[PDB]
Design a protein around this ligand. Structure first.
Ligand SMILES: [Mg+2]
Ligand SMILES: [Mg+2]
Ligand SMILES: [Mg+2]
Lengths: 439, 123, 439, 439, 123, 140
């Protein structure tokens, strides 16, 4: 391998798919051989010589470890850069992109562990995908919502409520000022709440709240299912109801099904909310797996309008992949975990969704860290308010707007956040009530 | 424990849950747009100023999103007093209208701002 | 949590989905709290109290850590057993089963790492799935192949050959005595070989080989694609050609798409070969992820006739999940990594596929370890033979049959394997030729 | 050839397709031979004798140059009249009509240049086509608009605006008094504005303007696409929205796709606006190509309700083909470039669309030259008004109505046009404002 | 810079953007029809005189296009005074109606004219 | 136009669609203005100013005549090179590619004649098309 696959003189082409792998070799395996193994094992590379190789020109199809750099503060760990020719991939198939790059290497004996950190998707390959059904700017225009983060509320308990009671909670949340309500990732179709009954009661609740407030509302209707057919039946009924948004667990449903749903959403005007259930099984450990930024790029290609992206409140790593989801161009920046400069050639950005144990006191921090283009999801942060859902929703909407006003006036959210919240409690009994339960 | 009202509680998106903005707060919001190089523009609506569905029902279609432009976007506007002066002018011609300030970011090429600046009779 | 979720007195129900998690808590977190966290975090469990919980009976929907046992030889690591009520799951949806159990917990702060080791799927839930389109016995009857492992040959190079040259290699392999040829997991549809041309040339080659030898042949036509639609178009053309078997990368394509394909295969009589590309990203590290036996049970439910399962030549761990894929009933056996007794209530077994760097000298070991019900896949082990593919195929078929005859005669493959091979080289010039290149 | 194809004694049949070609022979080629070459080369005529010709009666299938006349003031240029038998053409196929007549001759070596000037389409062939989906009178009845030219406004910039901003411009234009807004020919589906988002926002804007003014409004939604399928998907969504009119670039999309769209428009009640993008590539030079009147007849057969036809403000040539698009019968008139008398046997007329750099001061001239049955398209003439689109629309609508009133009262638009406009500025601040920016 | 009104600005097609026609201008428009050999006819509408969609929504379908015929087309009419006299008559019986003059070209066999001749109370 | 559309300093991007036009201007029209006319007329370029242009960044959507060279042995004829941004085109639509580039310019008054000689289709745009159903090697 060493000879054929380690090519430090290599100049990558603008059409090459580049990969940065965090390699931990078995003791006794030098870096250059490991990098050469990673490149061979994820491309051509056969344990024995075969006569058919002479039928083609294998140099044109091989992966090439073109660069290796030690990892600081780690023992026996390197970042190996591999380049894959454009011709190895099926146009528009995230499924094939992952199979080719990540389908075989991770089990290599010579490696003790392996983690894909980033991928440079070439613009020629980016153009073969649809990308987000709508994207940030189109979504804001459709919903007629500008200059502030969007607000959502996850309905709990996830299991146990009947479809109607679930819808009642949806109405009380939306009427209070939140933009969206949401189905938990686990909520598909189960004995106590079949999908159709849920869709229907959620439709009545959201239209009631929209008519009451005058503001456009939505509920992420979970379309994740066991088969493509079942998934399509759920999305089709959403279209029938005339509602704005559906949801999909892209990792558990998978890339083939997600792409299908993404295309259907584009063709029918449905916004698509993506939940990343199961991601931690893959991206958690620093030594083995795939970093979330790689899964985030994949989703932007397959397609989704929102994508769950954590909560921060490693800030920098997170902000790094937030730029990768939202912007058209992001320059290489190791301090932010960005290994390659990435261009999107006008593929729409995806709205990052912050979630998890957040409440009113995190509002100045979330607004400051994510800015306007984000969706802030509050489950217990709304359903746990002492006066109920509507007041819980009002407290969140008021705290958010107080932060946006203050920021716009030039106040520093980092330093004055708590004060901006305290100031609003003097005129918002709902917020005052929430603040008492939380900080 | 207080119950969130049901009647006459229509909202108008961003900043509509805060107490009505004074002239000074209005002036600071408009300065935010200018400082960002966004172009201010006013919109007004005399009929119903909330979203509804009359002409179609498919996903993402709503009536009532577009209001009507007060003159033209104020390109090269440097002073908030210019904007507030038009607000005054619009309010005089349309004391019965809902008037909001919107802004355009010609760089991202999209409308990026929208907040209620005036609401009529007990709204 | 401790109070609500750690229930050591709990008697599991025969309808409960049971999970064995390998838990590594953060220092300072006692086992009982961690186990209680794992159960809460993967079921109900909210960071703050919500009024809607009083609308139902949450005890009926909660996960329950009912047992905890220390891991031997590990520091601060336990196996926590969690029980999930039947009512939490959508019938026939592996996608929902994984989302519910594995969609959220792995990211819990209090846990340093987490690995799902096994799941006891209750018979009531097993009956909601189709399972394998055909299964072991039906596949043997259809192919009219009995009393020996099946033999396959993976075509290489994976990329680079034109469709016709690829088909030529397929014919030379099959005519030599192998039962199947195979598309590499990366081979979907690419610039130098579009799927339809491949399907067509592979069809001509396999029918030619079948007419020559008189034995039924097949080629695993890869149907993995970017969308459900594209995947279905490929399977439909296979049906049109009248061929016996298609292939799918179930992890990269995903569970929703796999189930769709599995149902279509059942309804059209197609055998389904499953490749586990990307599995090592998830199942490799002992401390975090999902063990392969869990992914193997999932595949048996969603559906597949063959499943890649490694190569052995931890023997015991492997044999443990081989029984889980093939048998109707497997008793709890910690020495083999079997945490729960598992019943399948007549769901057909799946044929394990051994692959990876194997050649003639491993034949006695593979036959002995896997027995008759297995598929032995030889890439370089055939295409690397000095006289070409047909002789490479004959050498493998002869070595296998020599081993089966010897075993049937009562010889010990473990102790006499090399001798049984040496004895056959005296009358098989093809095998003699292979043996010279290998041991 | 001379012998077989130059037939000056020939009496054309009423079923013959007659063609008038402007022929520029190579020096040394007499007119009669060139005319004979043009007829042979566009029909039978083979460089060598073939035995199969004796299987039929080729006299019945040959093109016949029956007349030749010198072109005045030109050196070595003639008008050759060729007659083609009815039997050469596929019923209802403009595609075949053009292939047969214009598919081969233009490259003939003996010719230095060649231009098709006109075609006499026989009534028997005219009856095989559908013609306009609706035509002039039906369109006026549907829109309930009588006694004046229709007014349109092309939205600019063509690229750059988001779908919503584009729709905002559409509403401001329509509410001011114009009947239609329009998508530029380049506007199909691109990264910053996908077709569906555009269709949807344009629908909201046009219904808002219609409800405000009480007058029926429309927006030419561009359905031109890369494939028949994509084109049909766009037209189908227009039908779904219930809007009145779609648009097609018939030359770049092509005749086969245009005919398909025309038939769909007839069956679904959609008006069809035709843009002639790329026409100048073909019709510009006097010496080679096809004159626009030929492309105009083709469109009337394939089908379209509006057709872009220039702006005049060679008047006479233009008025000549305007009659060919609108009337049921047009007599031969060389002074107007009409080489053949043409009957349409009740095929509906097409509304000519004048466009290009026009403003209020051209209004009396456009009304006088085109009369009531025309559509006057104003891009910068509206979007360039100092007070904005609505006032720009009002200025145009007022100027037009002032001209119609004046004309009806018996005033001479040719001599009093400027005065009629000046008189209206005394009571229309919007028009007064436009007049200041323009003349 | 003046803003085009939004309220109560419904229009009625041809000639409705010009100041209301005097008796003399009316008389000249009617003479245009006669001189062209087009047949004058009056139509009136008491309910809403603008287009709307109540009964169907497919392309090209609108309600409110047909109004109701005042008597019959005036075949063989030679004097505009005849038409204006009926306008007066119609106005007296329907002071609350929208009344427009339409004309038919029996040669092209289509309605070819339509202009508002009278609008009621502050319209 | 001259100012906005003739950009001799321009470095074309690998994603740009490049066009080589054989331009024959009307007498009295210098090459740089004609090239600038060809680029404007086949992209943005409006006869009068419109307020909506301020809603976007038109520099990102304009065609740019970046180079002009005389034609040898011809009188008053030049090859003008125009670059069109990738964003102007619909993926996989030859119909739109031709409409955008060739749909309007050929009729420009200032031009006496115009011929499109070649186009550099960028690889990013090439990947949006299917291309030949089979192609040479597969057919053989
Ligand atoms: Mg959740
Ligand atoms: Mg493989
Ligand atoms: Mg245009």
């Amino acid at each position: 391998y060493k000879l054929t696959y380690y090519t430090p003189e290599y100049e990558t082409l603008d059409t090459d798919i580049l990969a940065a792998f965090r390699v931990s070799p078995q003791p006794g395996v030098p870096p250059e051989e490991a990098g050469a193994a990673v490149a061979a094992e994820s491309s051509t590379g056969t344990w024995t010589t075969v006569w058919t190789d002479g039928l083609t020109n294998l140099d044109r199809y091989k992966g090439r470890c073109y660069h290796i750099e030690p990892v600081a503060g780690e023992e026996n760990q390197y970042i190996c850069y591999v380049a894959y020719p454009l011709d190895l991939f099926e146009e528009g198939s995230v499924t094939n992109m992952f199979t080719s790059i990540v389908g075989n290497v991770f089990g290599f004996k010579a490696l003790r562990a392996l983690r894909l950190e980033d991928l440079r998707i070439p613009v020629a390959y980016v153009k073969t995908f649809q990308g987000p059904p709508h994207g940030i700017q189109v979504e804001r225009d459709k919903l007629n919502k500008y200059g502030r983060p969007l607000l959502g509320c996850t309905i709990k308990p996830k299991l146990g409520l009947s479809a109607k009671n679930y819808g009642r909670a949806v109405y009380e949340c939306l009427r209070g000022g939140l933009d969206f309500t949401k189905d938990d990732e686990n909520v598909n179709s189960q004995p106590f709440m079949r999908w159709r009954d849920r869709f229907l009661f959620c439709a009545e609740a959201l239209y009631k709240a929209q008519a009451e407030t005058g503001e456009i509302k939505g509920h992420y209707l979970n379309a994740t299912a066991g088969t493509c057919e079942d998934m399509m039946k759920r999305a089709v009924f959403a279209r029938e109801l005339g509602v704005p948004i559906v949801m999909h667990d892209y990792l558990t449903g998978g890339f083939t099904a997600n792409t299908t749903l993404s295309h259907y959403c584009r063709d029918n005007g449905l916004l698509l909310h993506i939940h990343r259930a199961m991601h931690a099984v893959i991206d958690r450990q620093k030594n083995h797996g795939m970093h979330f930024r790689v899964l985030a790029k994949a989703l932007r290609l397959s397609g989704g309008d929102h994508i769950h992206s954590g909560t921060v409140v490693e800030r920098d790593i997170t902000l790094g992949f937030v730029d990768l989801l939202r912007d058209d161009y992001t320059e290489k920046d190791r301090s932010r975990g960005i290994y390659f400069t990435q261009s999107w050639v006008s593929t729409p950005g995806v709205l990052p969704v912050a979630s998890g144990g957040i409440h009113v006191w995190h509002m100045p921090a979330l607004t400051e860290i994510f800015g306007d283009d984000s969706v802030l999801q509050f489950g217990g942060g709304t359903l746990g308010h002492p006066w109920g859902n509507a007041p819980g929703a009002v407290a969140n909407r008021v705290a958010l707007e107080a932060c946006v006003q203050a920021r716009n006036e030039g106040r520093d959210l980092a330093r004055e956040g708590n004060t901006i919240i305290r100031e609003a409690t003097k005129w918002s009994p709902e917020l005052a009530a929430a603040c008492e339960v939380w900080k | 424990m207080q119950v969130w009202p049901i009647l006459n509680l229509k909202k108008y998106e961003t900043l509509s849950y805060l107490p009505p903005l004074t002239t000074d707060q209005l002036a600071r919001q408009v300065d935010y747009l200018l400082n960002n190089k966004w172009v201010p523009c006013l919109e007004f609506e005399t009929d119903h100023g909330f979203v509804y569905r009359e002409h179609h029902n498919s996903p993402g279609y709503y009536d009532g999103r577009y209001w009507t432009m007060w003159k033209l976007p104020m390109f090269g506007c440097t002073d908030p007093a210019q904007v507030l002066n038009e607000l005054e002018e619009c309010k005089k011609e349309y004391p019965n209208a809902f008037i909001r300030i919107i802004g355009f970011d010609s760089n991202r090429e999209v409308q990026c701002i929208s907040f209620i600046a005036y609401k009529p009779a007990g709204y």
